[PDB]
Design an enzyme around this catalytic site. Structure first.
Site, PDB file in Angstrom:
ATOM      1  N   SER A 146       0.856  -1.199   0.000  1.00 18.31           N
ATOM      2  CA  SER A 146       0.000   0.000   0.000  1.00 18.31           C
ATOM      3  C   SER A 146       0.887   1.242   0.000  1.00 18.31           C
ATOM      4  O   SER A 146       1.707   1.391  -0.925  1.00 18.31           O
ATOM      5  CB  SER A 146      -1.058  -0.091   1.102  1.00 18.31           C
ATOM      6  N   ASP A 244      -7.956  -2.756  -7.514  1.00 19.75           N
ATOM      7  CA  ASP A 244      -7.543  -2.533  -6.138  1.00 19.75           C
ATOM      8  C   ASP A 244      -8.595  -1.706  -5.405  1.00 19.75           C
ATOM      9  O   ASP A 244      -9.092  -0.709  -5.931  1.00 19.75           O
ATOM     10  CB  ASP A 244      -6.187  -1.824  -6.145  1.00 19.75           C
ATOM     11  N   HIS A 288      -8.321  -5.575  -1.206  1.00 21.16           N
ATOM     12  CA  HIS A 288      -7.263  -4.812  -0.542  1.00 21.16           C
ATOM     13  C   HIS A 288      -6.241  -5.723   0.132  1.00 21.16           C
ATOM     14  O   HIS A 288      -5.531  -5.270   1.033  1.00 21.16           O
ATOM     15  CB  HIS A 288      -7.805  -3.839   0.518  1.00 21.16           C
TER      16      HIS A 288
HETATM   17  O1  LIG Z   1      -1.877   2.667   2.700  1.00 18.53           O
HETATM   18  C1  LIG Z   1      -2.655   2.714   1.804  1.00 18.53           C
HETATM   19  N1  LIG Z   1      -3.770   1.875   1.561  1.00 18.53           N
HETATM   20  N2  LIG Z   1      -4.350   2.288   0.361  1.00 18.53           N
HETATM   21  C2  LIG Z   1      -3.576   3.440  -0.162  1.00 18.53           C
HETATM   22  C3  LIG Z   1      -3.674   4.260  -1.282  1.00 18.53           C
HETATM   23  C4  LIG Z   1      -2.737   5.274  -1.453  1.00 18.53           C
HETATM   24  C5  LIG Z   1      -1.717   5.429  -0.467  1.00 18.53           C
HETATM   25  S1  LIG Z   1      -0.450   6.681  -0.537  1.00 18.53           S
HETATM   26  C6  LIG Z   1      -0.391   7.124  -2.270  1.00 18.53           C
HETATM   27  C7  LIG Z   1       0.445   6.365  -3.044  1.00 18.53           C
HETATM   28  C8  LIG Z   1       0.529   6.658  -4.372  1.00 18.53           C
HETATM   29  C9  LIG Z   1      -0.226   7.670  -4.898  1.00 18.53           C
HETATM   30 CL1  LIG Z   1       0.018   7.894  -6.628  1.00 18.53          CL
HETATM   31  C10 LIG Z   1      -1.089   8.433  -4.120  1.00 18.53           C
HETATM   32 CL2  LIG Z   1      -2.084   9.759  -4.789  1.00 18.53          CL
HETATM   33  C11 LIG Z   1      -1.172   8.145  -2.772  1.00 18.53           C
HETATM   34  N3  LIG Z   1      -1.641   4.647   0.584  1.00 18.53           N
HETATM   35  N4  LIG Z   1      -2.572   3.660   0.728  1.00 18.53           N
END
Ligand SMILES: O=c1[nH]nc2ccc(Sc3ccc(Cl)c(Cl)c3)nn12
Length: 343
Positions: A146, A244, A288
């Site tokens: 994640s 996802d 997830h």
């Molecule tokens: O820890 C979890 N669970 N689901 C998620 C989704 C995004 C993130 S951080 C993130 C990472 C990449 C991008 Cl390109 C963006 Cl915009 C934000 N963290 N995360």
């Protein structure tokens, strides 16, 4: 409860609230493989947002309440039945307590309520591990799920460069990014602004070649796997569900023709971004679920499990291999068209 907590000896490398960061370690003497896993858990991007996270997600912001041990599960398990891939490796779990997608390099100070030190936490863990056996490693696999999967993409080359500069050119640094490969796509009904703000709030850092492509103010681009991946030098294996759940959440998808087309186009777009990623595992599932799951062995793409694909990747890094594939992307277009998807 077999990985043991070590708070960083450099107590200036801190979680959000100034408490020491740290790592959980289970050594496997005789193994020259080291797995360093980056925990996920979203992020926070301003004072008020971080204050709320401090109230109800404080373990993601502080080490004050961390347990002295954690059990290794999935790819962190030492049992061969649970972890066919790397059960005998040295296991490291790095708690996520910087709320910065592992990108930050700023201390708590007179002008900063919080420290955002994720990039420095990784470097300091690596430095302290060198004196605990990492100096003898043959492979350092930087893995994460994640926000930790995006953290792998943002940090794997910096770890490789750090080890070279410290005098350990024989350690092969590789990345495994799980569930951290997102699309900056149109929402179904109406995140990049939050990252843009976060980066300024955290003094966030992105890999140098990607930074040089996108230039000042546009570093947020490097948080998106399909844009940062081609700039990376270290071998990186990408694990990403085609549907996802966090991608769908930010897309505000929670079935009529418009939504069917949206979901199908999302899977097609994700699959397209993985076409030139030779080491990848991308099942057509809505999930997830992450690679530290105990049942991570169960999913298969084209009849090959992720532990097998990772083993084939190891062999490829010793010309495609007979019966041992590394590029495994589903082509069927709807969640759970793969029968092995998690229930
Ligand atoms: O820890 C979890 N669970 N689901 C998620 C989704 C995004 C993130 S951080 C993130 C990472 C990449 C991008 Cl390109 C963006 Cl915009 C934000 N963290 N995360």
């Amino acid at each position: 409860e077999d990985l043991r907590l070590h708070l960083l000896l450099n107590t200036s490398v801190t979680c959000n609230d100034g408490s020491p960061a740290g790592y959980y370690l289970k050594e496997s003497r005789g193994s020259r493989r080291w797995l360093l896993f980056l925990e996920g858990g979203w992020y926070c991007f301003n004072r008020e947002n971080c204050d709320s996270r401090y109230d109800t997600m404080r373990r993601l912001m502080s080490s004050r309440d961390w347990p002295r041990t954690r059990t290794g599960t999935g790819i962190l398990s030492s049992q061969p039945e649970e972890n066919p891939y790397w059960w005998n490796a040295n296991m490291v779990f790095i708690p996520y307590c910087s709320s910065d997608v592992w990108s930050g390099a700023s201390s708590k100070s007179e002008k900063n309520e919080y420290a955002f030190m994720g990039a420095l936490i990784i470097q300091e863990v690596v430095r302290e591990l060198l004196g605990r056996g990492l100096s003898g490693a043959k492979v350092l696999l930087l893995a994460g799920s994640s926000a930790g999967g995006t953290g792998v993409l943002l940090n794997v080359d910096r770890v490789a460069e750090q080890l070279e500069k410290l005098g350990y050119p024989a350690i092969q640094v590789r990345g495994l990014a799980d569930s951290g490969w997102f699309l900056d796509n149109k929402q179904y009904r109406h995140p990049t602004e939050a990252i843009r703000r976060g980066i300024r709030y955290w003094n966030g850092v992105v890999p140098e070649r990607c930074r040089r492509q996108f230039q000042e103010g546009e570093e947020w681009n490097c948080f998106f796997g399909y844009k940062v991946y081609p700039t990376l030098r270290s071998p990186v294996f990408v694990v990403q569900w085609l549907f996802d759940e966090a991608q769908l959440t930010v897309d505000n998808v929670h079935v009529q023709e418009g939504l069917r087309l949206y979901i199908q186009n999302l899977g097609r777009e994700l699959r397209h971004t993985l076409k030139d990623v030779p080491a990848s595992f991308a099942p057509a599932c809505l999930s997830h679920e992450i690679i530290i799951r105990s049942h991570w062995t169960d999913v298969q793409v084209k009849g090959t499990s992720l532990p097998r694909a990772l083993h084939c990747w190891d062999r490829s890094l010793h010309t495609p291999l007979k019966g041992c594939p590394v590029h495994l992307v589903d082509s069927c277009p709807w969640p759970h068209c793969n029968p092995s998807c998690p229930t």
